[PDB]
Swiss-Prot record, chains A, B, C:
Effect of substituting residue 98 to I: In PIDB; 90% reduction in the rate of microtubule assembly
UniProt repeat feature Tau/MAP, residue ranges: 4-34, 35-65, 66-97
Region (Microtubule-binding domain): 1-97
In-chain residues carrying the UniProt-annotated modification Phosphoserine: 14, 22, 34, 53, 81, 85
Protein purpose: Promotes microtubule assembly and stability, and might be involved in the establishment and maintenance of neuronal polarity. The C-terminus binds axonal microtubules while the N-terminus binds neural plasma membrane components, suggesting that tau functions as a linker protein between both. Axonal polarity is predetermined by TAU/MAPT localization (in the neuronal cell) in the domain of the cell body defined by the centrosome. The short isoforms allow plasticity of the cytoskeleton whereas the longer isoforms may preferentially play a role in its stabilization.
Residues of the full protein shown: 589 to 698 of 758
Complex and partners: Interacts with MARK1, MARK2, MARK3 and MARK4. Interacts with PSMC2 through SQSTM1. Interacts with SQSTM1 when polyubiquitinated. Interacts with FKBP4. Binds to CSNK1D. Interacts with SGK1. Interacts with PIN1. Interacts with LRRK2. Interacts with LRP1, leading to endocytosis; this interaction is reduced in the presence of LRPAP1/RAP.
Record protein name field: Microtubule-associated protein tau
Glycosylation positions in this chain: 9-10, 76, 82, 98
Domain note: The tau/MAP repeat binds to tubulin. Type I isoforms contain 3 repeats while type II isoforms contain 4 repeats.
Processing and modification events after translation: Phosphorylation at serine and threonine residues in S-P or T-P motifs by proline-directed protein kinases (PDPK1, CDK1, CDK5, GSK3, MAPK) (only 2-3 sites per protein in interphase, seven-fold increase in mitosis, and in the form associated with paired helical filaments (PHF-tau)), and at serine residues in K-X-G-S motifs by MAP/microtubule affinity-regulating kinase (MARK1, MARK2, MARK3 or MARK4), causing detachment from microtubules, and their disassembly. Phosphorylation decreases with age.
Residues modified as Omega-N-methylarginine: 78
Compartment(s) of residence: Cytoplasm, Cytosol; Cell membrane; Cytoplasm, Cytoskeleton; Cell projection, Axon
């Protein structure tokens, strides 16, 4: 067989994390007078920190699926749109001090 | 068979986390006079910290699925839209001091 | 068989992370009076830090799938659009002090 032996003496292990994984000032603004939106933001961010870690010790792990880490993400979509007619008309007749803004987007970081 | 033996002496293990996983000032603003919205934000963020950890020790784990970590995410959508006619009309006749803003978005970080 | 032996003496392990994985000031602004949007931002960012780590120790792990890490991401989409007619008309007759802005985007980092 397989003998496993571990000897440790006068160790010193330290693991420090600071402000890890923080998410701040996130804005989600979809829409804008649209018709169909499939808004599915997906995040899988992993911030892993290990120190002095040991893996698994197995003797004859035989048969089928053993310590199998399986992750499946299925996001299948079926979106259909049937419209008779689409018009975006900005009809501005006459005369005067008119100021028209449509879908006005302004970003100012400063 | 397989013998496993672990000896430890005068260890010192430390694991420190600070402000970990914090989420602040998150804004979700969908809509805007739309028709159909599928708003499914999904997050799987993992912030893992380990120190002095040990895995599993198995003797003949044989047969079928053993210590299998299976994660399935199914988000299947079926969205249908049938509209006779779509009009966005900004009819501004006459004359005067008119100021029209439609879907006005302004971001000012400062 | 296979003998495994580990001897350690007077070790000193340190693992420090600071501001790791932080996400700040993220803006998602889709839309703009569109028709069909499939908005699926997907992130798999991994920030991994290890020190003094050990892998797994296996004796005859034979049979099937063993310690298999399988990740599947399926995002299949089927989007259909059938429209009779699409018009974007900015009809501005007459005469005056008119200022028309459509889909005006201005970014000012400063």
């Amino acid at each position: 067989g397989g003998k496993v032996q571990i000897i440790n003496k006068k160790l010193d292990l330290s693991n420090v994390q600071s402000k890890c994984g923080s998410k701040d000032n996130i804005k989600h603004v979809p829409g804008g007078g649209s018709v169909q939106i499939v808004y599915k933001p997906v995040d899988l961010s992993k911030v892993t920190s290990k120190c002095g870690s040991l893996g698994n010790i197995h003797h004859k792990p035989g048969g089928g699926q053993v310590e199998v880490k399986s992750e499946k993400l299925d996001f299948k979509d079926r979106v259909q749109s049937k419209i008779g007619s689409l018009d975006n008309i900005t009809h501005v007749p006459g005369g005067g001090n008119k100021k028209i803004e449509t879908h006005k987007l302004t970003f100012r970081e400063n």
